[PDB]
Structure formats: structure tokens, C-alpha cells
Scaffold this active site. Structure first.
Site, short mmCIF file in Angstrom:
data_model
loop_
_atom_site.label_atom_id
_atom_site.label_comp_id
_atom_site.label_asym_id
_atom_site.label_seq_id
_atom_site.Cartn_x
_atom_site.Cartn_y
_atom_site.Cartn_z
N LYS A 162 104.73 61.02 95.36
CA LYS A 162 103.82 59.97 94.98
C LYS A 162 103.30 59.19 96.19
O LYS A 162 104.09 58.88 97.07
CB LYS A 162 104.72 58.99 94.20
N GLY A 169 97.51 58.17 87.79
CA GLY A 169 97.68 59.59 87.54
C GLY A 169 97.14 60.45 88.67
O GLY A 169 97.39 61.68 88.66
N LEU A 207 111.10 62.85 86.22
CA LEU A 207 111.77 62.73 84.95
C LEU A 207 111.07 63.55 83.89
O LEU A 207 109.88 63.39 83.65
CB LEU A 207 112.02 61.28 84.49
N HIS A 212 108.36 55.54 77.80
CA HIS A 212 107.81 54.50 78.60
C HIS A 212 108.13 53.15 78.00
O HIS A 212 107.61 52.76 76.99
CB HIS A 212 106.31 54.73 78.72
N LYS A 241 96.88 55.17 77.22
CA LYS A 241 97.75 54.70 76.14
C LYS A 241 97.00 54.68 74.83
O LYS A 241 95.78 54.44 74.80
CB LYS A 241 98.44 53.36 76.39
N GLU A 279 106.98 48.02 84.19
CA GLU A 279 106.90 49.38 83.66
C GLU A 279 108.16 50.23 83.99
O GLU A 279 108.56 50.39 85.15
CB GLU A 279 105.63 50.03 84.25
N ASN A 293 102.68 45.55 86.91
CA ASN A 293 101.35 45.09 86.57
C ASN A 293 101.40 43.59 86.60
O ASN A 293 102.06 42.98 85.76
CB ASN A 293 100.90 45.56 85.19
N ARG A 295 99.57 41.13 85.97
CA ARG A 295 98.51 40.69 85.10
C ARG A 295 98.87 40.84 83.63
O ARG A 295 99.95 41.34 83.23
CB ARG A 295 97.28 41.57 85.38
N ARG A 341 94.89 51.33 69.58
CA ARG A 341 93.65 50.96 70.21
C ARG A 341 92.50 51.63 69.52
O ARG A 341 92.61 52.79 69.18
CB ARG A 341 93.66 51.44 71.62
#
Ligand SMILES: Nc1ncnc2c1ncn2[C@@H]1O[C@H](COP(=O)(O)OP(=O)(O)OP(=O)(O)O)[C@@H](O)[C@H]1O
Length: 450
Positions: A162, A169, A207, A212, A241, A279, A293, A295, A341
Site C-alpha cells: 500500500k 482503492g 486480510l 468493515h 459502500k 476505520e 476519516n 470528517r 444509499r
């Protein structure tokens, strides 16, 4: 009492803007809705006390036009700016500047942003904080393979290479043996320079079948910090999501006070201010830190439901200098919440489907929350995202919350465009989903996705 913000800028648009406008009206805060020439018809735009056209459709000229926004405050005499989520909410130069122009920034400080903005750093900070992390290099991978070969072996394959620039992503690669290591580090290093303009990269374990789980927190920057239980957002489709819920099924109160308390410690440790989210990947009754995050999030309503806490007011409260109005011990997790959503999209292409809404009807009833700016004869533009609404249902229990949600998805009428509603229903009907505790891979695979 009333040592509240005179008037703030709502540096955003859509459902989020409306929501924020709403909390403003309750606190008696004046509102300035800055918008793009194409969002002249936004619901929130129509309700604001003051309005201002900052630019043209395209984000880079409107919603990401830092000066425009900043000047919008100048002219209006607002005292603060609320970024909502997703534009500049995580942009430290904008926060920096807001501060520098002499406005309040409804969020933590820029320093904090950059800090959490860099995965590597983020990780180190929390490692320090007692927050549970994924095992990895605990640093940026070097250039001499030997040691890297060693990192891996230690953490053990598979792994994941990463970058620290985030993205979403983008900038990740899975290695499962010593053969692909080299390429990977390289492929990934290259994908980063181009994309985020930071080839820096770190290694961590990959993982397989984790969920999540995310923890909602609040800090006043005065020493106080509370955790508001968790949220399960494992319902993903291509990293997007789709379904969020609180609490997270299978999560015991004990576990809940575990990861919570440390999350709370970390906030203090870092001098965190305002709302924010931790997260976590979750496998084997173990938590692992992925990111932070700095925010408010799209899925915050679920949490406000099971807790009775109004996130936005609190942000607004912290922002105006107030201390936390709540204490941990006053925070109680009650019932269950599920948010769907609503997207303007093609269930086949999964492609945005803009257009005008001819007919619209929102579901009501007990424990039903409709969060959206759409109405009838509203034109959903092609410029920005696909999200048009949030459908949140509450219940004394999960199974109840689900039941309500089915009904709600049906009473719901949105004509004149393509939506993801059918999909929502299908998941609602998901027998696996009914049982619950599904992984972030569930959706993709059921979707007959490759
Ligand atoms: N160590 C890991 N093992 C397994 N899955 C991982 C690991 N790290 C990340 N992931 C997967 O990668 C996805 C994206 O990770 P991450 O949150 O770090 O991406 P991002 O670039 O910061 O995403 P976003 O901006 O959309 O939130 C995760 O949701 C998760 O599916």
C-alpha cells in the site's frame, strides 16, 4: 448557552448540505449556501438565508475552488466554514487557508489532517496510541529487497503493498509469495508517483475475509473525547459502500468498549478536534486499523439513531468553542439502524443515470428517516456523484429495522431516472444478509461479480 456561531458557510452540496442546513436552523446559525451554476436548484440552496454562486458546474471551478469559497465567506461575513464530506473535507491546504484567512474550519486542524492523511504516519501515531494495527513494515518500504523479503516473511503472506497517499482503492497490490514481491513494490511504486505524486509505500498483511467495522468518535480538543459505538459497512460493491448499519452485529459491548476506549485515547493523544471516524478491518474477533476519516461521513445517520446524538450539532458546538456536551457514560446504544444509499444509477452498467425526476414520493412512518434533497421536477446533473438520498430505518432490533426498510423501499417513488432501489430490495431480501455478519466480499460475489 448561546455562544453559538453567527453564520457559517456550507461549503458543500446535495443531501449533506441540506442536513447541515437543518442542524444550523436548529441552533439558529445563519446559513450561506455557496453553489455552482448548475446546482442553482438545490433544495438546500432554496432554504439558505444567503446564497452565492461560486462557479460553473465543474468541481474544480466551483466546489473545489478554494478562493471562490473562501471569498464567499468574506463577502458574507460568516465566521466559519463547514466542508461536509468529500470535497475539501480532507484537504489540509484548504483548512490551512481557512484558518489563515481568519475563518473557523469545521474540522480538526490542518496539521492533524496531513497527519492522518499519510497512512504511514497515521499508523505510527496510532501504534503509539495503543490502537490495534495491521502488522506491516511500520514504515516505508525501502529499496533493498533483502529486508523487504524479510518483512514479508515475518508478517507472513499474503500481504499488501500500500501507498501512503490514500486514493481510494487505487495504489494497492497483493503479494502472496517471494516471486511477485519485487514487481509488486515496483508496479505499486509507479502507480503512486503518477496518481498521488508520492511513490512512498508500506507493507502490511492482507486480510482474506474481514468485515468493515468503523468507530465514530467526537473530540472537543479540550481533553474530551467519546466513542459512539461501531458501524458495519461491509456491503460493498467495487469499494463503493451500499449498506451501512449500527450497531455491528456480533460485536459485544465489551469488545465495543475495548476498541472504543483506545480510539478515544488516540483522539486525545493527537489533539483531535471535531467529528471523525476510525476505520477497522475485522476478522477473528480482532480489530485492525486501516485508516482515519477526519470528517463527518455519509453514513452518520445510523449512529445518530442508535445513540440519539446529533453529530452535526456537536461539530457546530465544538467549532464555536464548547466542550463536549456528553460524557461516555451517558452514551447508550439503543435499537438497530440500517441505511441504504440511494443512487441515480443503472443497475446494469452501474453507471450514473442523470435526468429529471418527474414523480417523487418519500416513505414515512415510524422509525423511517429520509435524507435527500430531491423533489419532483428536480434535475439530477451529470457533473457530480450519483447519490441522491439515504434511506435510514430504525428498530427495536435488527430484524425490525430490516422489515421497515423493505416496506420503505417499496413506498418509495422516484420516477424519471434509473436508481439502485431494486438492488437495495434484493439485499434486504438477502437471506445471508438477514442472518447478517457478511464480509466485504459478499456483495461483489453475489452480484455474480468477477
Ligand atoms: N491489509 C489489508 N488487508 C485486506 N484488505 C485490505 C487491507 N488494506 C486495505 N484493504 C482493502 O482495501 C480497501 C481500500 O483500503 P483503504 O481504506 O486503505 O483505501 P483508500 O484508498 O484509503 O479508500 P477510500 O478513500 O475509498 O476510503 C479496503 O476497503 C479494503 O477492502
Amino acid at each position: 448557552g448561546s455562544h453559538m456561531l453567527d453564520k457559517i458557510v456550507i461549503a458543500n452540496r446535495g443531501e449533506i448540505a441540506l442536513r447541515i442546513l437543518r442542524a444550523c436552523k436548529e441552533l439558529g446559525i445563519k446559513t450561506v449556501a455557496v453553489h455552482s451554476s448548475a446546482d442553482r436548484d438545490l433544495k438546500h440552496v432554496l432554504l439558505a438565508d444567503e446564497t452565492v454562486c461560486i462557479g460553473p458546474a465543474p468541481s474544480v471551478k466551483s466546489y473545489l475552488n478554494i478562493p471562490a469559497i473562501i471569498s464567499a465567506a468574506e463577502i458574507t461575513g460568516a465566521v466559519a466554514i463547514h466542508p461536509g464530506y468529500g470535497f475539501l473535507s480532507e484537504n489540509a491546504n484548504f483548512a490551512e487557508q481557512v484558518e489563515r484567512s481568519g475563518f473557523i474550519f469545521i474540522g480538526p486542524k490542518a496539521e492533524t489532517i496531513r497527519l492522518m492523511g499519510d497512512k504511514v504516519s497515521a499508523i505510527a501515531a496510532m501504534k503509539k496510541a495503543g490502537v490495534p494495527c495491521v502488522p506491516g513494515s511500520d514504515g516505508p518500504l525501502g529499496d533493498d529487497m533483502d529486508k523487504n523479503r524479510a518483512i514479508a516473511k515475518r508478517i507472513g503472506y499474503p500481504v499488501i503493498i500500500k501507498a501512503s497517499g490514500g486514493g481510494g482503492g487505487r495504489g494497492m497490490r497483493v503479494v502472496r509469495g517471494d516471486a511477485e514481491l519485487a514487481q509488486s513494490i515496483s508496479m505499486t511504486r509507479a502507480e503512486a508517483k503518477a496518481a498521488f505524486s508520492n511513490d512512498m509505500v508500506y507493507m502490511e498483511k492482507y486480510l482474506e475475509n474481514p468485515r468493515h467495522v468503523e468507530i465514530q468518535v467526537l473530540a472537543d480538543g479540550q481533553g474530551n473525547a467519546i466513542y459512539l459505538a461501531e458501524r458495519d459497512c461491509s456491503m460493498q460493491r467495487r469499494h463503493q459502500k451500499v449498506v451501512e448499519e449500527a450497531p455491528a452485529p456480533g460485536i459485544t459491548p465489551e469488545l465495543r468498549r475495548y476498541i472504543g476506549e483506545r480510539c478515544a485515547k488516540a483522539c486525545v493523544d493527537i489533539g483531535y478536534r471535531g467529528a471523525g471516524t476510525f476505520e477497522f478491518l475485522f476478522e477473528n474477533g480482532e480489530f485492525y486499523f486501516i485508516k482515519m476519516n477526519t470528517r463527518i461521513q455519509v453514513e452518520h445517520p445510523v449512529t445518530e439513531m442508535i445513540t440519539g446524538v446529533d453529530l452535526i450539532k456537536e461539530q457546530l458546538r465544538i467549532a464555536a468553542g464548547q466542550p463536549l456536551s456528553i460524557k461516555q457514560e451517558e452514551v447508550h446504544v439503543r435499537g438497530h439502524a440500517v441505511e441504504c444509499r440511494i443512487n441515480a444509477e443503472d443497475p446494469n452498467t452501474f453507471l450514473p443515470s442523470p435526468g429529471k425526476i418527474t414523480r417523487f414520493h418519500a416513505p414515512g412512518g415510524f422509525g423511517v428517516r429520509w435524507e435527500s434533497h430531491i423533489y419532483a421536477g428536480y434535475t439530477v446533473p451529470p457533473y457530480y456523484d450519483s447519490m441522491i438520498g439515504k434511506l435510514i430505518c430504525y428498530g427495536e432490533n435488527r430484524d425490525v429495522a430490516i422489515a421497515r426498510m423493505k416496506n420503505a423501499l417499496q413506498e418509495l417513488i422516484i420516477d424519471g431516472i434509473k436508481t439502485n432501489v431494486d438492488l437495495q430490495i434484493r439485499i434486504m431480501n438477502d437471506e445471508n444478509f438477514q442472518h447478517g455478519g457478511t464480509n466485504i466480499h459478499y456483495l461483489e460475489k453475489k452480484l455474480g461479480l468477477q
